[PDB]
Design a protein around this nucleic acid. Sequence first.
DNA 1: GTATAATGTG
Lengths: 299, 49, 49, 146, 49
Amino acid sequence: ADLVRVYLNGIGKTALLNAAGEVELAKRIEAGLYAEHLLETRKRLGENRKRDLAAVVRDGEAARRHLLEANLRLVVSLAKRYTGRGMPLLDLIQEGNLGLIRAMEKFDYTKGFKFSTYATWWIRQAITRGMADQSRTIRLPVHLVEQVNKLARIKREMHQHLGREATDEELAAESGIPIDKINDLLEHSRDPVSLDMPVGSEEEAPLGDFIEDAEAMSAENAVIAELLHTDIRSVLATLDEREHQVIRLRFGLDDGQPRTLDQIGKLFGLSRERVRQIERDVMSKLRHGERADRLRSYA
Amino acid sequence: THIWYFKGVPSRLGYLLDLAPKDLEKIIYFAAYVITSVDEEMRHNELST
Amino acid sequence: ERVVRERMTTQDVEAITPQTLINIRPVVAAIKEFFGTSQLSQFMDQNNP
Amino acid sequence: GEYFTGAMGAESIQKLIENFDIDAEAESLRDVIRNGKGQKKLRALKRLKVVAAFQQSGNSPMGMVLDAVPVIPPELRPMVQLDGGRFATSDLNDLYRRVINRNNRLKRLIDLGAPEIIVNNEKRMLQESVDALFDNGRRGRPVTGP
Amino acid sequence: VNFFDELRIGLATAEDIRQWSYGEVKKPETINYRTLKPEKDGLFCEKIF
DNA sequence: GTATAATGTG
């Protein structure tokens, strides 16, 4: 058990390297990559050159492996600081390993700086970006995450300075972000509550058990809607059958596609201006007789 | 591997595969290599050589 | 006190004052949590005196 | 490294179980049980019952080592909005997110290519993630968010 | 209709999971932060579920 | 995309 323990036992299998060692490793990697490029770039393939380039590629693979394994422990050192947030320790360690792999393909020995100098930047970048990307259920834009963290830091600084939790107005004044955007950010900075959490000690039944479906009401769709549809199929049919077809095409009772005045006039051969009067007649008829008696509800 | 098998009591994987629970838990979590197979026939035919 | 000792181990020693060294958030949080969720802090039943 | 081939991890156990023959082991263990050795006889009997259960099935033991986990329909793990825009969701979403992230990172490491130590650590993390998904506390320290 | 003589339980294999699933989940996103809609290939994608 | 420099939890 303790996967962290086994990884930390494995990571220390290799010791660190001095400046000269890292410089020679960078030189070896440069030679390896040069041979790799030449192997496929050359139009005429040398025979002994083939074997030499194969050996150089093997040595370059070994060199990158050695450099990464030697410098791994910096990954753990940097990752230990970011713990306590959403992601666990090993996730951050893997993020830092990916960052180190990214960095190693750009290191230079001519500058003369130590490898950690050019490795820490990329490790921190990778860890922070990974935490921003895969540490929250509802993923947010990186800029919005940065703004949320800025709001949190401003609030903590104000609390430190004044000895009391900062007011919303003072937060807006210090940060300059209006209260509306501050409220939005605060709403975006809450971990969703888990449904399995016991609620009310009511036999410790989870919160999920008390959430109504909030839709698909039985009685509404069961009786009211279908009976409205049937009574309409009766009433509108009791009108002129031509007018019934006109309504069907006008709103789309059968085939959708609500026919506009001009379109329905073209289909029926009438003019765009007749449909307004047709609809006036239909609405006048629908408001009198047994039609009103049936359809007084549903409004 | 399914958790229900290499961790159950009895561990069906252990019983079927005649591996002690400690060795099984070590192998699953990438602790120690294991020799899956060997060309025993070639080794025997080449035992002299 | 844990937070304070960490902060004083890290923060500069020249211009340090206890005002910038104390963090009042955890204690108020603990008091509010106790008075809100503690099982020994109950609604006073008021059927009658 | 020209005769014996060996490796570590769940893939090794997959290979070992595939190479293992249930019927032959059942016959050999029946031969052993036909003898005495009461001290070892109980263990031999338990192994024999398990192996015979596998043998009579007509299926294969490879089903124990998974290659594609299923995900329940979202309605069984709903994500609803409570009054005040405070989202509520089941922890199944967190576990599935952990598994998906581990798997994607493993694919990225394999595509990029890295020393076997980091790849093995990633595979171990993925195994632990699936284990935590299927059961919490069944092995090791349970995961706790709040 | 409701003629259920027996109900058996077996050990699922990779092919069973493949052929009893209507899609593959290839990203961890659950729901969009602003538009409140499932994201492509997410845990809630309409294409899948 | 960064180059003082950092190099194994909790």
